[PDB]
Amino acid sequence: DVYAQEKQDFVQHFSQIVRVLTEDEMGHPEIGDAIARLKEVLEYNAIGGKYNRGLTVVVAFRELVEPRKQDADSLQRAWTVGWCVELLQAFFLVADDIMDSSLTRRGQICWYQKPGVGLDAINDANLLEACIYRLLKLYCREQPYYLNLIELFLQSSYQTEIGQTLDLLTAPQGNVDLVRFTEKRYKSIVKYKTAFYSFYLPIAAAMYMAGIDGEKEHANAKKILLEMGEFFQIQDDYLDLFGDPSVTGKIGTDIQDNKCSWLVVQCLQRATPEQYQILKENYGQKEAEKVARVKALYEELDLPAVFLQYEEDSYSHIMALIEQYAAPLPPAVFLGLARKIYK
Amino acid sequence: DVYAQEKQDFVQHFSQIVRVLTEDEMGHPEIGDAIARLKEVLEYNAIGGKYNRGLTVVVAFRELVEPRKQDADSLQRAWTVGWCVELLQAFFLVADDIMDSSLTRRGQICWYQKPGVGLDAINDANLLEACIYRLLKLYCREQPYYLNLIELFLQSSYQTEIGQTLDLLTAPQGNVDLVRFTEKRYKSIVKYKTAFYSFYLPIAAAMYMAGIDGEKEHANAKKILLEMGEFFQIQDDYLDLFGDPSVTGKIGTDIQDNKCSWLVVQCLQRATPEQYQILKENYGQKEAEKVARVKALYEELDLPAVFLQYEEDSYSHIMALIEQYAAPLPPAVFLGLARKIYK
Ligand SMILES: O=C(O)Cc1c(C(=O)O)[nH]c2c(Cl)cc(Cl)cc12
Ligand SMILES: O=C(O)Cc1c(C(=O)O)[nH]c2c(Cl)cc(Cl)cc12
Ligand SMILES: O=C(O)Cc1c(C(=O)O)[nH]c2c(Cl)cc(Cl)cc12
Numbered sequence: 093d094v095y096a097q098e099k100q101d102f103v104q105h106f107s108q109i110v111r112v113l114t115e116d117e118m119g120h121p122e123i124g125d126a127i128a129r130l131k132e133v134l135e136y137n138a139i140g141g142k143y144n145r146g147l148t149v150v151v152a153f154r155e156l157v158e159p160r161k162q163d164a165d166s167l168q169r170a171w172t173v174g175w176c177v178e179l180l181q182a183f184f185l186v187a188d189d190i191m192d193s194s195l196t197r198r199g200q201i202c203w204y205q206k207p208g209v210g211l212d213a214i215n216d217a218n219l220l221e222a223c224i225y226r227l228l229k230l231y232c233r234e235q236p237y238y239l240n241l242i243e244l245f246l247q248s249s250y251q252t253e254i255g256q257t258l259d260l261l262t263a264p265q266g267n268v269d270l271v272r273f274t275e276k277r278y279k280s281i282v283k284y285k286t287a288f289y290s291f292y293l294p295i296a297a298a299m300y301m302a303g304i305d306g307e308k309e310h311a312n313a314k315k316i317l318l319e320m321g322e323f324f325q326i327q328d329d330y331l332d333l334f335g336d337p338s339v340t341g342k343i344g345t346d347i348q349d350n351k352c353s354w355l356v357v358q359c360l361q362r363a364t365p366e367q368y369q370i371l372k373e374n375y376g377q378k379e380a381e382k383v384a385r386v387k388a389l390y391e392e393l394d395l396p397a398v399f400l401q402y403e404e405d406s407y408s409h410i411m412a413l414i415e416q417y418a419a420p421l422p423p424a425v426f427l428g429l430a431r432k433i434y435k
Numbered sequence: 436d437v438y439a440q441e442k443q444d445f446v447q448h449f450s451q452i453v454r455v456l457t458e459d460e461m462g463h464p465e466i467g468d469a470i471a472r473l474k475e476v477l478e479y480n481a482i483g484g485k486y487n488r489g490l491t492v493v494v495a496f497r498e499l500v501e502p503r504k505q506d507a508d509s510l511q512r513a514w515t516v517g518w519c520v521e522l523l524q525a526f527f528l529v530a531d532d533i534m535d536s537s538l539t540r541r542g543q544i545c546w547y548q549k550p551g552v553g554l555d556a557i558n559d560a561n562l563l564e565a566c567i568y569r570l571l572k573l574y575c576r577e578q579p580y581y582l583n584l585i586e587l588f589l590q591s592s593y594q595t596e597i598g599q600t601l602d603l604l605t606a607p608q609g610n611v612d613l614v615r616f617t618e619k620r621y622k623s624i625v626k627y628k629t630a631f632y633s634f635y636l637p638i639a640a641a642m643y644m645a646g647i648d649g650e651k652e653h654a655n656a657k658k659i660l661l662e663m664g665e666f667f668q669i670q671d672d673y674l675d676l677f678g679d680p681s682v683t684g685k686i687g688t689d690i691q692d693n694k695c696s697w698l699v700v701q702c703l704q705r706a707t708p709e710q711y712q713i714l715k716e717n718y719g720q721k722e723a724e725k726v727a728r729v730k731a732l733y734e735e736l737d738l739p740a741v742f743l744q745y746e747e748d749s750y751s752h753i754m755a756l757i758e759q760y761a762a763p764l765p766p767a768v769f770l771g772l773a774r775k776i777y778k
């Protein structure tokens with residue numbers, strides 16, 4: 093839709109992004125070799141995903157700014173900020189794949205898993221983060237929302253990191269203590285680790301660029317966006333298992349990874365002492381035979397029906413939030429995103 | 436001296452720092468467990484060093500600001516910014532110890548080497564970095580140099596990271612290609628990886644807080660400070676081997692670590708085809724028998740005498756730089772630091 097058509101101008105802008113970032117070496121050939129490594133890090137990790145978060149910034153910017161103030165310069169900045177979001181994303185993914193010892197990402201081998209990279213990816217990840225601020229300075233240094241965007245990107249990083257800490261404490265590599273897999277802990281992890289930077293950040297960035305720096309307007313948008321983010325992750329957890337790999341384009345590994353999935357949280361709320369024991373001896377195992385056992389326990393608890401019920405109640409709640417907190421912003425900004433998330 | 440006496444008020448301020456950072460959880464008990472982990476990360480990694488960089492900020496601030504504008508509030512901010520520098524330092528050390536697989540740091544076991552930590556330290560390191568900006572916001576949000584400090588900390592991180600990339604490309608874990616151990620590469624690594632954040636950052640921060648935001652004044656201070664930083668690292672490399680472990684409080688491991696030391700760079704410039712071969716078969720080995728062989732080759736090339744000559748020429752050059760670029764700043768600011776570095 094609005095994404096598929098705008099996606100072209102976005103992905104194609106990457107070339108200028110990479111150029112602008114790897115062009116400070118012109119004045120300092122001494123770090124040329126480092127800049128070449130940086131370019132390789134950018135091309136490998138910032139490219140290959142769906143660019144939903146970055147596109148949201150562009151899309152939201154056009155709906156929040158009058159068609160006359162949408163000069164080529166303003167649009168170039170919108171694309172850049174959208175790419176900054178993707179760079180923040182790349183920063184998290186590269187670091188996260190190392191921390192949980194992942195093998196692949198976006199279909200390809202994890203950056204750190206490439207021969208000659210390994211733990212050096214920790215520094216590569218840090219450089220991705222730094223590029224964010226280099227771009228903001230280069231393209232928005234003179235804009236009146238400059239400081240607001242810097243603070244937004246910083247806060248988003250902190251929240252994500254705080255959420256990552258929480259997740260690491262909740263599901264320690266090895267320990268399958270299902271006791272900490274509570275609903276309040278799950279919602280808190282989703283809020284900090286995913287919702288803030290995935291759904292609030294993009295619209296907030298667009299809002300600031302549109303001149304909407306009101307602290308109240310941001311609180312209202314955030315109210316709506318964090319709820320959308322929570323549903324998004326809950327749906328993602330559901331589809332991870334009960335989803336169709338040919339449609340989703342991915343195979344479920346949440347159970348095997350001992351993840352604090354929404355499904356496992358629900359299963360723990362709707363389970364008899366014996367059912368619990370069944371989960372403890374099958375959760376976090378590679379053996380498909382054990383995995384199928386967990387999935388079997390989920391269906392029996394009618395989780396797929398529970399999710400269906402939650403999805404309808406969730407949608408209603410989002411429409412109410414939009415109808416109540418959208419203004420003075422165009423409801424479409426939120427409706428467009430919602431429609432995209434809810435299947 | 437000015438450090439030993441001021442060091443008390445600095446280290447003692449840490450308690451407030453930790454308190455202020457782990458107090459946002461009061462409004463969000465949901466992340467309490469994460470905040471507890473953050474506190475543990477701070478206490479373990481930001482404490483235990485010499486605090487030279489952070490103290491430099493405090494020391495330089497008092498010499499750049501009139502005794503009347505040194506109210507309790509201004510001094511508290513100076514201490515905080517000095518701690519932000521230490522936090523940036525902690526961020527680099529934690530990440531660097533993982534990347535080069537170090538065992539100990541500041542006498543104690545490396546954070547990531549502690550049971551239950553491991554690669555999670557990558558996120559811990561990122562949180563240290565984030566605390567920097569949380570503190571600046573909390574203490575300097577209203578100050579007119581707020582944006583300048585944010586940009587300074589960001590640029591310093593980028594430079595350090597770019598310098599880290601260079602170092603990683605120069606001495607790949609395993610590859611002992613002595614061909615890339617050139618003087619120009621060594622100086623470039625020192626400049627980016629160490630000098631900028633170690634010697635320019637601290638005084639620059641003080642300068643901005645004192646209202647000295649002149650782009651020319653910063654370029655002049657940087658001119659002096661990067662030269663001091665280069666000598667510092669060259670001296671550090673020299674002492675790493677020819678230093679007295681009881682006085683330095685550390686044992687040399689540069690040769691064993693295949694580091695791009697200043698000594699090895701000099702040895703490569705003053706060596707016969709046969710001497711080179713001797714270095715290639717003994718550099719980067721744990722065997723003390725091989726290490727002693729390298730050290731033996733250094734003395735024979737009279738490197739200790741070369742360093743002595745360089746140290747005197749270096750000192751003269753620094754005094755000339757100070758006499759030429761210090762103004763309008765108090766020469767003492769630079770003289771004090773220099774005296775501290777040159778033994
Ligand atoms: O891109 C992703 O990581 C997941 C994802 C999907 C999706 O998987 O269809 N869709 C998204 C939308 Cl509409 C918005 C945002 Cl902010 C993220 C996503
Ligand atoms: O679990 C992991 O982190 C490693 C891993 C990845 C992957 O990393 O892409 N993919 C997996 C799949 Cl499809 C199935 C199983 Cl049973 C394990 C994995
Ligand atoms: O603290 C360190 O890492 C090394 C170090 C030493 C020293 O080792 O004596 N002295 C320093 C001085 Cl005076 C200034 C700065 Cl900025 C760093 C150092």
Ligand SMILES: O=C(O)Cc1c(C(=O)O)[nH]c2c(Cl)cc(Cl)cc12
Pocket residue numbers: 535536537538539540686688691692721
């Ligand atoms: O080289 C390393 O990175 C590990 C290491 C550390 C350390 O990590 O503290 N310290 C060492 C010493 Cl004192 C001697 C040797 Cl032969 C190796 C090491």
